[PDB]
Symmetry: D2
Subunit: 324 residues, 4 copies
């Protein structure tokens, strides 16, 4: 049986493997749990045979020079880490794979969720009824509106982009996407209309922010640029918008909105965002679902099985061209 | 040009018509507004020749035999009314048409809204965030799940079910449907999987309804979602309520037994429930369609064409 | 349970599978009649009789009429059926799928010279490249036109799903709204003929005027009913290299052994065989059977 | 000074793979040097030292490669890697080799579905019958004539071609089983297919597109099964296939063959139940044009320093194999 070192922290085997998957995994491999701060500490025997690393440990040239069978490192924190001589793991042919796309479907779903909540006031309609201020249907629907309509714009488009395009595929709506690093040919074939940020921002009833582009726009001036009763949905990275610029457009009652991410987390208790009518709130929980984490396990398993049978990993994301 | 009685019920011509289809109507038809409850007392020059009624007005045989012209009654209130002689219309060959399909999309749409909200605690995540109650990231999500790859069951299958099917498209869920009337082999070529009411209840994470209750609520899954969208008469409402209060299930409704509802009613106090004041279908875009749906049918029957557009009413006279 | 079986032209041996007659016996029972105890109590009817205003009043316990030969074999007591109540429906929809599939078939072959490249290969004269593909084009993203849109149009539209094309349909009967939600763009006949790369004909004369109107590379597929087509004009259009075409139906079926189409380069011929599949007849049973088990529940079909 | 690319596309050409709009963009944005594929070494040091891309598949030596410090990628326009390079020293330098083969998936898939309906329904024969006069009219003709709609379909392989084959089959709502052991089963499933063992595909499918395999393979298929072979004859026992076809066990269609061009002698030229195609499934002009368009899309990404995305990337293990 091939040997794999486990050093998944701050993730863990218990979290990322269903029973079925965990049994499959140990039935198939010797999985030695190991201290990530001390990989070098392992058996000079253990290091000689390791074909895989599940996780993201610190590593150095000398300890890496000790691992002649290492085939791949499977990153399970969604994020690449300035952690080890990537140059030599490239020289050697050693793939580094990531499992972050597990968080797409979770985030799409709750994302379409807010879209429908805003476009029909599902929340305000529940609180009003809850305490007792109806408007009994028809009378509620001043500002109601279908998504099937309908002009959708996506700011960014990676995995979260695609997951969203998928859930929306039942709405026969119009989907404008802005993305710098995807050719117009690839967008068109993903079922979307490649577009300027200004088109997306402007000719759109529903706007989703979904990926950074990059590193770090959309301020007071970007918001006014919108259509009147516009739906603006923030799913990734709060640092890209001016929050108070955004709140301003909401109280003003220009656009309507919902975010899952905030300029500070957790947000202080006194913070304005809490009282603002017309803004749906979500405590950075769009992606952390158990089943998302159990999927990481499945992926790892698929990718191991390919590399065991000599083939390149397919399932988790590869890395290459990223100095940082 | 030809003649049409305009007597819609709570629906007015204003509401169910955009300027476009409105101005195209007298432009195309001689149309006369008329008290819907006094339709016999319209001028007999009129009765004898008018060929379409746009409304749901009550009609007696006497008022009927004086409409030899009349080829269809076009109803703009979704549900057929025990209102007239539905036996003469048949011989006379008169069509009664329904425009009720226009509530399929908006209800589907808001149905997916509840499910995702039920599935993910959207509403009580928000209410909490108002009040400072919180729980960030993974702490809030103990019983938050995906709909994609989940098991959905529908009860009945209207236009509403076809509309629900369509919106679910991108979820790749297992769609079990239970519906007596429509032949087993017609759901198959419509996307969904035919199934006994048992499975639809016992083996669905999400159950949509488009008589029953109590034991049924106990036969449902671990922490499954009930989403109720039409015909309140079918659920024992207290049985649902306790089934919700127990914690055994989570639920959402757009229909209620007393409508409007008592201000005392305890549902409004009820954790694990999401309320809507019958607002699933009542959308201006929905209303405006009825109009165009009507014109299309009129124009069609003018050629003398058995209309395809609106819904018809065959052996559903028995009820 | 009672039903009347005047199948001919169609059999019962051949419009039901095993499980399908197996079930029709053990849930009903039936006759070996002649479309030209009984009279009164009869609930159903699997046939195409002219029977017959008098013989009708004699059958007062009737529910539904089941034409198992697509077309309505008139005459029934036309008005004393809708005034009386009894039900009139067809099985004709089973032919939709088979016609569609083979329609796409002809399209692809016209689109890529499949038949010509198999003949060439046989006769030793095939171009390999590259070089064999000068007129080869792709159906994907390509502007297809349909003329008519019955049960048939629908099936076509469905086998086309995965092609990603702009589909234009000319149909005066169906209201714009029904087509557009049904996945197609509604259009005027000119805007079809003139603006399509592949035109399919499904359901008083289409002639020389039209064929000149079509785009120069265009492909003309004829699937139902010759009558509305100027057969001569069609043959001149193809003959001149203006268009390529294909047709399952002809001015006269069978067609004379000496008919100039039998040797017209650019034209794919099929002998009125779009719809006649064994599986379509077997689906006929299912259809009537399921809709019987519905009628005897006070429900429509 | 604009980035320089070396063009050596033979057996293809710039005239063929670039359309007008695209060929102009290419020379606006790039300094394209046309080279003789057998002599890249001879180009100036001035060119070799400044070159950033190669369009085509020229034989290259570590020797030459060493003289190319700026080389970012080799954009291979024949669809197939050649063993004419030190693949070790690429990779090393992070020089990408990409492939333009995806332009074939769509044309190959349409003709593939076109071969299946031909088989399913005797389109070729029926036309030939009408030509000659012999001649069955609708019903007696369709004795051995099925739908694809309800059927069970099977795919051996699944790259771009499978995907395109899955797209065009989507209107038919069939059950599609596919064997691809280079894809993880989750990736198959999200692509709308049911992953399946080789022998299930072989034994449980009314239609089999190929996208080992000899007499036991053929004898295991269901009795009326159609077998559509679209890529690389390399993997069928062509003699067994013909035997299987002539006995009336299966009907079949191929666009590829054991020697190409075939000899005029060849048995498969006279064989019934076989639809023939002269390796033309994928060579359409519009297809060759799409290579120019991809090549340019990828050169753009790399000028911006991103990795390639529109063309497929040569992986150490493929080049190993």
């Amino acid at each position: 049986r091939p040997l794999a070192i486990s050093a998944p922290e701050p993730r863990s085997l218990d979290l990322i493997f269903s029973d079925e998957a965990r049994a499959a995994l140990h039935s198939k491999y010797e999985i030695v749990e190991a201290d990530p701060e001390n990989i070098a500490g392992l058996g000079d025997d253990i290091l000689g045979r390791a074909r895989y690393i599940i996780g993201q440990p610190p590593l150095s040239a000398e300890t890496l020079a000790r691992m002649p069978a290492l085939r791949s490192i499977l990153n399970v924190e969604s994020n690449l880490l300035n952690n080890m001589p990537y140059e030599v793991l490239f020289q050697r042919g050693i793939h580094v794979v990531t499992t972050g796309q597990v968080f797409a479907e979770p985030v799409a779903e709750i994302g379409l969720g807010f879209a429908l909540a805003l476009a029909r006031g599902i929340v305000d309609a529940d609180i009003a009824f809850q305490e007792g201020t109806e408007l009994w249907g028809g009378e509620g629907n001043a500002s109601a509106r279908l998504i099937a309509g309908s002009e959708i714009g996506i700011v960014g488009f990676g995995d979260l982009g695609k997951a969203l395009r998928r859930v929306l595929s039942g709405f026969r709506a119009r989907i404008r996407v802005f993305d710098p690093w995807l050719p117009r040919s690839m967008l068109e074939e993903n079922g979307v209309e490649p577009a300027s940020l200004e088109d997306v921002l402007t000719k759109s009833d529903f706007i989703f922010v979904v990926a950074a582009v990059t590193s770090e726009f959309l301020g007071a001036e970007a918001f006014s640029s919108m259509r009147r009763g516009a739906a603006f949905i923030l799913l990734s990275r709060a640092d890209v918008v001016d929050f108070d610029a955004l709140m301003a457009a909401v109280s003003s009652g220009h656009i309507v909105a919902a975010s899952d991410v905030y300029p500070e987390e957790p947000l202080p208790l006194d913070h304005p965002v809490r009282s603002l009518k017309g803004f749906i709130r979500s405590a950075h929980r769009a992606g952390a679902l158990d089943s998302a984490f159990k999927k990481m396990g499945d992926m790892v398993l698929e990718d191991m099985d390919l590399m065991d049978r000599g083939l390149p990993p397919m399932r988790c994301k590869r890395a290459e061209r990223e100095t940082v």
